[PDB]
Amino acid sequence: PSRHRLVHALERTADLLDILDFKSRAYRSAARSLEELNFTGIPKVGKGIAAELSDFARSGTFAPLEAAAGQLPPGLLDLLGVRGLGPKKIRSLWLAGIDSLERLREAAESGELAGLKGFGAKSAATILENVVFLFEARQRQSLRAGLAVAEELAGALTDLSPAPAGDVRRGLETVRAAELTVTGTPDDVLARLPELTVQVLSGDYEGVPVEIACAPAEARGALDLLRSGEHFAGQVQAAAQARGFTLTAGGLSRGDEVLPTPTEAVVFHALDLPFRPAEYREPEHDDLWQTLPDPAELVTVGDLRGMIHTHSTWSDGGASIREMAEATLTLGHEFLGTADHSRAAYYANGLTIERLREQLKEIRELQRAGLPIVAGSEVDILDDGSLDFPDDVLGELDYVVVSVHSNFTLDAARQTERLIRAVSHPLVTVLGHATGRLLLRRPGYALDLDAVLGACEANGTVVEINANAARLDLDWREALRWRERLKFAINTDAHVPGGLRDARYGVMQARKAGLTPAHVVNSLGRAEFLDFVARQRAARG
Ligand SMILES: [Hg+2]
Ligand SMILES: [Zn+2]
Ligand SMILES: [Zn+2]
Ligand SMILES: [Zn+2]
Ligand SMILES: [Zn+2]
């Protein structure tokens, strides 16, 4: 209600638009007018600002900020929660390739943060402190933070033969702790990591909970099975007892017998069991996993020739198209897929039709210069199911991604009809992050996924497995159920060059679903890709 509160929301919207001038200025000026006032009458508050305020008074929720929550990248929404980061700093972090809490934490660690204009050693440590607060708040950590921390601590435990364990090892979209496995004694570990406390050892590394379990070389194999873990651990112990063995972190035994257990494989042999890959040790796999491909057949980051659905400076990215293309090449991939937002995504600097035409001219130039690029767009799905760009405009593109970035509160039946309509379009090639979920922030919108996926199958539209650690959507559980009926795309949705290294998280999800390079369009070379979508479009109408 407070009028001073309205001024703040108006002032926070201009700051958000500043991050990525005809409404940033419009919102900033409307804030300065509401200042000196002891909405339809107020100065400088056009039809726009007036209407939303009344709704803010009513609803108790400022519309423009809700729109932005749905349009902005997950990592940016995070940085906006780091106490002490102003608009100008968040913008310079973005342009510097720092796009997430985890990546910010690493930048602080390495001196990279301090090396930026406006940051020094001191502010870089204050920011690291403030990021530690965000992490300790969360009950569970993102796969990115947990995996990064486990990888870093392994670095200090090199001669103890470190290995990721538990949740990070099998790619849980969300993670209880940075879990590591190690051979040696709690003193060996305590000598390289004095911080920890012996309970296994546990502790807290920069807000991220840590657990390190150790064992003698001869028990390591059993320790690795048990720390996989919880659901599977119970399974494998049940299996052991049912056969006269006792499985413990201390090793595999049989009455008097103590069988040497150096490797997981050895334990399976001893119980006369088929080896069960860590990728398949979730509950949902219990009755399915022997139907799925051998790990050596599953997709890998190296199988991703085409890196599609990426963002640039044209939209709400932090790098030019050239920097991104160069980046995908030095990471070992073949070509880059452009895909900036459209018109409707206002708070994400979406492209008007005219600006899109300008982007296409630039892409043609980069191609002349020998850069492997395919031009696309992430077209917003309007609330009725129609697309943000006209058909003739969509026709200029090499490929089209469709996505929801607005109206997350439509009823289930309206939302389902909306997405079925969009994935049924003749020109659509990929459905972006189907569910709109953001791990640790907001659940996805209410819809009937099976109906929507069915519509994808019927139109041969490929469904995206968004590799961004805050999305990991389509969920691997739904991909597992539909692996026979859909083609998938493992897309990073990179808003920054380093974002292309997220592919590794999408791949971990794809492998649990049992996907091979043949299930994933990204495995096609550039020319193979361009006629896949030509065939895809020919197969309809
Ligand atoms: Hg130990
Ligand atoms: Zn974006
Ligand atoms: Zn044509
Ligand atoms: Zn998107
Ligand atoms: Zn996107």
Do the strands 178-183 and 201-205 form a parallel or antiparallel pair, or are they unpaired? unpaired
- Topology annotation, domain 1-71: DNA polymerase; domain 1 (1.10.150)
Report which of 200, 201, 202, 188 is spatially closest to residue 249, judged by C-alpha positions: 200
Domain ranges of the chain: 1-71, 72-139, 140-217, 218-272, 293-541
Least Cα distance to 253 among 269, 273, 267, 233 occurs for 267
391 is in an annotated binding site: no
Among the bound ligands, name the one nearest to the CA of residue 436.
Answer: 4
User: Residue 59, Cβ neighbours under 10 Å: how many?
Assistant: 11
CA of 395 to the centre of ligand 3 (A): 8
Q: Ligand 2 centre from 342 Cα, in Å?
A: 10
Neighbours of 518 (CB within 10 A): 13
Fold of 293-541: TIM Barrel (3.20.20)
Residue 540: both structure tokens together: 């309809």
Residue 262 CA to ligand 1 centre (angstroms)? 14
Cα of 261 vs centre of ligand 1, distance in Å, is 15
Ligand nearest to the CA of 473: 4
Q: Which residue has the tokens 């590799």?
A: 467
- CA 183 to centroid of ligand 2, rounded, Å: 43
Query: Which pair of structure tokens corresponds to residue 317?
Result: 């990215």
Contact 354/361 with Cβ under 8 angstroms? no
The helices-and-strands tally (H runs, E runs) of the chain is 22, 19
Fold for the domain defined by 218-272: Beta Polymerase; domain 3 (3.30.210)
Separation CA 232–CA 230 (nearest Å): 6
Ligand 2 centroid, distance to 315 Cα (angstroms): 7
Proximal ligand: closest to the CA of 427? 3
Whether residue 444 has a cis bond before it, omega within 30° of 0 = no
User: Which of the following CATH numbers is that of domain 72-139: 1.10.150.20, 1.10.10.10, 2.130.10.10, 1.10.1610.10?
Assistant: 1.10.150.20
Among 59, 9, 3, 67, CA closest to 34: 3
The gap between the terminal CA atoms of the chain, to the nearest Å, is 53
CA 184 – ligand 1 centroid, Å: 6
Documented resolution in Å:
2.5
Which residues fall within 8 angstroms of residue 83, CB to CB, at 6 or more apart?
130, 133
d(CA 429, CA 427): 6
Q: How many Å apart are CA 263 and CA 391, to the nearest integer?
A: 58
Q: What values do phi and psi take at 395, rounded to 5?
A: -75, -20
Helix spans in 261-384 (H): 264-270, 321-330, 353-368
Whether residue 309 is annotated as binding a ligand: the answer is: yes
Ligand 2 center to residue 30 CA distance, Å?
A: 27
Ligand showing the shortest atom-to-Cα distance for residue 313? 2
140-217: CATH architecture: 2-Layer Sandwich (3.30)
What is the distance between the alpha carbons of residues 331 and 321, in angstroms, rounded to a whole number? 15
Helices 3-19 & 24-35 angle (0-180, nearest 10): 160
Q: Can you list the alpha helix ranges (DSSP code H) found in 262-396?
A: 264-270, 321-330, 353-368, 391-394
Is 52 assigned to a binding site? no
* Residues of the chain with a following break (C to N over 2.5 Å): 20, 38, 199
Quickly tell me which residue has 């969009």 as its tokens.
Answer: 422
Establish whether domains 1-71 and 218-272 are of one fold. Answer: no
Distance in angstroms (rounded) separating the CA atoms of residues 324 and 334: 12
- What are 352's two structure tokens? 């008007």
